[PDB]
Amino acid sequence: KSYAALIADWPVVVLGMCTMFIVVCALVGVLVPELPDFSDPLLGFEPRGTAIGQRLVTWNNMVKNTGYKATLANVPSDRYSRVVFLWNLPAIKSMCNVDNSRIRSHPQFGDCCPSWTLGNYIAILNNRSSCQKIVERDVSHTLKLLRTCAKHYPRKCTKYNAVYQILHYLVDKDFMTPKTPALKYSMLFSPTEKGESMMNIYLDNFENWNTGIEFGIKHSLFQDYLLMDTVYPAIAIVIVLLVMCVYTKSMFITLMTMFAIISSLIVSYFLYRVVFHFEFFPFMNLTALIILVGIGADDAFVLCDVWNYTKFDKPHAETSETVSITLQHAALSMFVTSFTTAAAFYANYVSNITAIRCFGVYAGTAILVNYVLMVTWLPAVVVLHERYCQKCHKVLFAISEASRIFFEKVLPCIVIKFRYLWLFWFLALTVGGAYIVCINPKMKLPSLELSEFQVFRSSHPFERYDAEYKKHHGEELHMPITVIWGVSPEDNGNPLNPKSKGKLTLDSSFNIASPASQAWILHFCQKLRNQTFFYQTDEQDFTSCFIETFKQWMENQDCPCCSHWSFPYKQEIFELCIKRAIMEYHLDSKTPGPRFDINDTIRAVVLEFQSTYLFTLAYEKMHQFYKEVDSWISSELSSAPEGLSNGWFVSNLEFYDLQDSLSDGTLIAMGLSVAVAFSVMLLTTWNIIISLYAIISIAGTIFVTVGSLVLLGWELNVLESVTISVAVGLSVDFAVHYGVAYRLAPDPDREGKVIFSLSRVGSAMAMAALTTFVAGAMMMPSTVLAYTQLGTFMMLIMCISWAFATFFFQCMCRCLGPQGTCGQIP
Ligand SMILES: CC(C)CCC[C@@H](C)[C@H]1CC[C@H]2[C@@H]3CC=C4C[C@@H](OC(=O)CCC(=O)O)CC[C@]4(C)[C@H]3CC[C@]12C
Ligand SMILES: CC(C)CCC[C@@H](C)[C@H]1CC[C@H]2[C@@H]3CC=C4C[C@@H](OC(=O)CCC(=O)O)CC[C@]4(C)[C@H]3CC[C@]12C
Ligand SMILES: CC(C)CCC[C@@H](C)[C@H]1CC[C@H]2[C@@H]3CC=C4C[C@@H](OC(=O)CCC(=O)O)CC[C@]4(C)[C@H]3CC[C@]12C
Ligand SMILES: CC(C)CCC[C@@H](C)[C@H]1CC[C@H]2[C@@H]3CC=C4C[C@@H](OC(=O)CCC(=O)O)CC[C@]4(C)[C@H]3CC[C@]12C
Ligand SMILES: CC(C)CCC[C@@H](C)[C@H]1CC[C@H]2[C@@H]3CC=C4C[C@@H](OC(=O)CCC(=O)O)CC[C@]4(C)[C@H]3CC[C@]12C
Ligand SMILES: CC(=O)N[C@@H]1[C@@H](O)[C@H](O)[C@@H](CO)O[C@H]1O
């Protein structure tokens, strides 16, 4: 009644009140929001509300505070630039041919200084300024000085001033051969220092295919490159509209479904920012468009043919009955498909990183509201179509009709002449792929990152430099493990907003009792010093536990305070004299006393220590390191008294928790995606053999995805989480619509049922598969890795999933398939 009546009664009014909602949403969507910034590409990737993040951001909060006077009132520069994008020495003309280039339009003189560092450097012999090709002296000096000494480092004086180190600091280090190709690309520039001005010269004097660069414009050039990034999807959306127009035989419908998708995205953005107060907006929210123009148009293809399939079968009776029947059937199928997809992102939200959460919410609301709009624009497409050179058009129409029937008769014949074969070949592929690509070496975590990921394609300069400079700055440091007791580590800030961290909170219950708890810290420090894994070969620190300096200062000064006798009784004023003793600087943290707008005595007892292991940018060892130290500190704080009960562990390991949060977040997202997948598959089709069939198909297709995906050197960094979520969403998206379509077959046979059911499902889905495939494939040519990544991903997923779901379900339904309602429960 309600739907169909409202549809048939006033279509222009529902059109009006809808478009009203869209235009007002757009207006407010421009008025209120305070300019979503794209300055930092990876803005706010610090995982929040996850111990380490909390404990880190507390000690990080400690850094930005300390707002007082004293608390005792009483050359080849690393920052310069370089090209370096492969080291040979036939630089007879090349070196200064690189020099006389676009590095002089804006001088910006620093440290005109002759800034070659290879060319003028090699020419240290004579001439003083210019690039000079003195062949015999060049070769003889180069070959000699290259073969003099490399590895064994004021006992040997053959060089000029400071030569050797500087020589071996520009050119590639892999020259330890003791022995003697052309690309016109090497390591030279060492120009004026990097920053923003370097952007200005780059943008103005590059992007003409002119020796690739590194001078830290990645984070700004990315933001500017969003123009030609924005360009490509415009071609993607018009072409998907065009091919949709080719199929459904009505230009109006297809324009309206397209405008519906874009309206659905902007109404999602309004509903996102206005109600779900999230001031942050990362870049992946843009890639939402690309994922939404593939699956957003899908539902439409399941509608038009349904409307067409009834108006032929049912006899021109009246509009209301036809729209009612088509709507109830198409709506079940459209809700299940869209919700199953949306649920992935909505579940993915349970992850505890900032950007993925934000992206998930936005795309989630986008896919869900898209369904509402699709159902509410059904009336429009159908009823407007009711009240609606040409020779070539009619030939095309004949071709289109003929080809659809050609398809309709062939595909069932081919999929049934499969004859138990496609089952074997594809099952063997999946189990084989999966069982190898989920045990042995196949993937890793984003180790070579340091919060500097691949934000562009490998063909472009800035990424490729990673591989180039792999030929340096990395020093084997020890983990400054620092338990502090100074402040209650509680995150009093909005978890979603990355720009507001919070403020420190003092612990009034924490009071170093002057007569007590000193012997505790001593026995604790002794207990540590006796425990292993404590690197203590160096002895010239003098600030290790803070008690030693105390023991020295109570030992001295007695031979102002002027009251020191035996061990600590009154205290306070002696601690203050010891503060003076320390102050007589290296004052930042590094020492335990009161800071951060404090006029009174001790409130922070910031203790320092050294480590066992080295700073790697990978998992494994760091986790075992963390676990062991946390488990030890958790014991020693269990031995602690009432006066000091609160302490925790922290060091410089932001990267470790990023990896841990990503790994957990993906797992729990995957877990809920498979859970809702099974649940909703049960909701649509009431038999269970079909439900197992489904989940096996889901398992197979996903194991194709993250096996084929990774083999393309694609470890799980940041996006790969939400991709895996898409993969589960779109796998079941196909499976479901196959399912009910089988269940509702007129005959009680196992082959005629297949043929009919198959020919149906194929005709909806293959077109919708093609729709997505083109929408994804067209995005492959671009610069930013984000778009390339998601575009080529979802392309592969659809390309697999459709034909996967197709041939599995039907080859499985051929022989092993269900009979007279075997397994259905009321
Ligand atoms: C999903 C597809 C359709 C791409 C998304 C389209 C737009 C929502 C984005 C893409 C490019 C973005 C623009 C990229 C560059 C800038 C310049 C920016 O200016 C500054 O950075 C401040 C001054 C300066 O540094 O130059 C103001 C926002 C703006 C217009 C951005 C606003 C939002 C835009 C238009
Ligand atoms: C349309 C009909 C005839 C079915 C055929 C499907 C193909 C068109 C699909 C199946 C596998 C897909 C390929 C799977 C893997 C890749 C590798 C990938 O190559 C890269 O490594 C580029 C990424 C990078 O190095 O930056 C680019 C897309 C491509 C060729 C895909 C493009 C589309 C392909 C060829
Ligand atoms: C949809 C599915 C297929 C996605 C799976 C992708 C990742 C979430 C997987 C692939 C690699 C897995 C990691 C491979 C290796 C390990 C080491 C493992 O270490 C131990 O076994 C501890 C004991 C020891 O060996 O010392 C802990 C889990 C972890 C991080 C795994 C966690 C889950 C990861 C990140
Ligand atoms: C529906 C089925 C029957 C046809 C469509 C399946 C394809 C979408 C899949 C099947 C196997 C996949 C391929 C498996 C292996 C590779 C090789 C891989 O590249 C390499 O391993 C480089 C070679 C080397 O390592 O020496 C790139 C992805 C690719 C082409 C995969 C891309 C997608 C493919 C072609
Ligand atoms: C077109 C391809 C892509 C298939 C995609 C699925 C839907 C379009 C199919 C699945 C089940 C089909 C329905 C199966 C049964 C019927 C009952 C039929 O009404 C009758 O009961 C008439 C029986 C008779 O007198 O023969 C009207 C069409 C309808 C809704 C079918 C319309 C098309 C549906 C919804
Ligand atoms: C607290 C404690 O047990 N300290 C002992 C110390 O008495 C002993 O002199 C030393 C010999 O190496 O070993 C330490 O661990």
JSON list of N, CA, C and O in Angstrom, two decimals, residues 172-185:
[
{"chain": "A", "resi": 172, "resn": "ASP", "atom": "N", "xyz": [77.12, 6.79, -4.63]},
{"chain": "A", "resi": 172, "resn": "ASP", "atom": "CA", "xyz": [76.56, 5.58, -4.00]},
{"chain": "A", "resi": 172, "resn": "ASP", "atom": "C", "xyz": [77.65, 4.75, -3.30]},
{"chain": "A", "resi": 172, "resn": "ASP", "atom": "O", "xyz": [78.74, 4.57, -3.83]},
{"chain": "A", "resi": 173, "resn": "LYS", "atom": "N", "xyz": [77.32, 4.26, -2.10]},
{"chain": "A", "resi": 173, "resn": "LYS", "atom": "CA", "xyz": [78.30, 3.63, -1.19]},
{"chain": "A", "resi": 173, "resn": "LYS", "atom": "C", "xyz": [78.83, 2.29, -1.70]},
{"chain": "A", "resi": 173, "resn": "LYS", "atom": "O", "xyz": [79.96, 1.91, -1.37]},
{"chain": "A", "resi": 174, "resn": "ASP", "atom": "N", "xyz": [78.02, 1.58, -2.48]},
{"chain": "A", "resi": 174, "resn": "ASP", "atom": "CA", "xyz": [78.41, 0.29, -3.06]},
{"chain": "A", "resi": 174, "resn": "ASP", "atom": "C", "xyz": [79.49, 0.43, -4.15]},
{"chain": "A", "resi": 174, "resn": "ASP", "atom": "O", "xyz": [79.22, 0.32, -5.35]},
{"chain": "A", "resi": 175, "resn": "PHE", "atom": "N", "xyz": [80.72, 0.70, -3.70]},
{"chain": "A", "resi": 175, "resn": "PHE", "atom": "CA", "xyz": [81.93, 0.78, -4.55]},
{"chain": "A", "resi": 175, "resn": "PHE", "atom": "C", "xyz": [83.11, 0.00, -3.93]},
{"chain": "A", "resi": 175, "resn": "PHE", "atom": "O", "xyz": [84.26, 0.22, -4.30]},
{"chain": "A", "resi": 176, "resn": "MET", "atom": "N", "xyz": [82.82, -0.94, -3.02]},
{"chain": "A", "resi": 176, "resn": "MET", "atom": "CA", "xyz": [83.86, -1.72, -2.31]},
{"chain": "A", "resi": 176, "resn": "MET", "atom": "C", "xyz": [84.20, -3.00, -3.09]},
{"chain": "A", "resi": 176, "resn": "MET", "atom": "O", "xyz": [83.98, -4.12, -2.63]},
{"chain": "A", "resi": 177, "resn": "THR", "atom": "N", "xyz": [84.74, -2.79, -4.29]},
{"chain": "A", "resi": 177, "resn": "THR", "atom": "CA", "xyz": [85.11, -3.86, -5.24]},
{"chain": "A", "resi": 177, "resn": "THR", "atom": "C", "xyz": [86.61, -3.90, -5.59]},
{"chain": "A", "resi": 177, "resn": "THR", "atom": "O", "xyz": [87.12, -4.97, -5.92]},
{"chain": "A", "resi": 178, "resn": "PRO", "atom": "N", "xyz": [87.28, -2.75, -5.51]},
{"chain": "A", "resi": 178, "resn": "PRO", "atom": "CA", "xyz": [88.68, -2.57, -5.94]},
{"chain": "A", "resi": 178, "resn": "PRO", "atom": "C", "xyz": [88.85, -2.89, -7.44]},
{"chain": "A", "resi": 178, "resn": "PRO", "atom": "O", "xyz": [89.76, -3.63, -7.83]},
{"chain": "A", "resi": 179, "resn": "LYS", "atom": "N", "xyz": [87.95, -2.33, -8.24]},
{"chain": "A", "resi": 179, "resn": "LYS", "atom": "CA", "xyz": [87.89, -2.57, -9.69]},
{"chain": "A", "resi": 179, "resn": "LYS", "atom": "C", "xyz": [87.42, -1.31, -10.45]},
{"chain": "A", "resi": 179, "resn": "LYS", "atom": "O", "xyz": [86.99, -0.33, -9.83]},
{"chain": "A", "resi": 180, "resn": "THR", "atom": "N", "xyz": [87.51, -1.36, -11.78]},
{"chain": "A", "resi": 180, "resn": "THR", "atom": "CA", "xyz": [87.14, -0.24, -12.65]},
{"chain": "A", "resi": 180, "resn": "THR", "atom": "C", "xyz": [85.62, -0.17, -12.85]},
{"chain": "A", "resi": 180, "resn": "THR", "atom": "O", "xyz": [85.11, 0.73, -13.52]},
{"chain": "A", "resi": 181, "resn": "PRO", "atom": "N", "xyz": [76.36, 1.37, -19.58]},
{"chain": "A", "resi": 181, "resn": "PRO", "atom": "CA", "xyz": [75.04, 1.91, -19.24]},
{"chain": "A", "resi": 181, "resn": "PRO", "atom": "C", "xyz": [75.05, 3.44, -19.21]},
{"chain": "A", "resi": 181, "resn": "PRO", "atom": "O", "xyz": [76.05, 4.06, -18.84]},
{"chain": "A", "resi": 182, "resn": "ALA", "atom": "N", "xyz": [73.92, 4.04, -19.60]},
{"chain": "A", "resi": 182, "resn": "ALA", "atom": "CA", "xyz": [73.75, 5.50, -19.65]},
{"chain": "A", "resi": 182, "resn": "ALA", "atom": "C", "xyz": [72.27, 5.88, -19.55]},
{"chain": "A", "resi": 182, "resn": "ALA", "atom": "O", "xyz": [71.48, 5.55, -20.44]},
{"chain": "A", "resi": 183, "resn": "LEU", "atom": "N", "xyz": [71.92, 6.58, -18.47]},
{"chain": "A", "resi": 183, "resn": "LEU", "atom": "CA", "xyz": [70.54, 7.04, -18.20]},
{"chain": "A", "resi": 183, "resn": "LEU", "atom": "C", "xyz": [70.38, 8.57, -18.09]},
{"chain": "A", "resi": 183, "resn": "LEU", "atom": "O", "xyz": [69.25, 9.07, -18.17]},
{"chain": "A", "resi": 184, "resn": "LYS", "atom": "N", "xyz": [71.49, 9.29, -17.91]},
{"chain": "A", "resi": 184, "resn": "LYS", "atom": "CA", "xyz": [71.50, 10.74, -17.62]},
{"chain": "A", "resi": 184, "resn": "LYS", "atom": "C", "xyz": [70.70, 11.07, -16.35]},
{"chain": "A", "resi": 184, "resn": "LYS", "atom": "O", "xyz": [69.79, 11.91, -16.36]},
{"chain": "A", "resi": 185, "resn": "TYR", "atom": "N", "xyz": [71.06, 10.38, -15.27]},
{"chain": "A", "resi": 185, "resn": "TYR", "atom": "CA", "xyz": [70.38, 10.49, -13.97]},
{"chain": "A", "resi": 185, "resn": "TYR", "atom": "C", "xyz": [71.31, 9.97, -12.86]},
{"chain": "A", "resi": 185, "resn": "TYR", "atom": "O", "xyz": [71.64, 8.78, -12.83]}
]
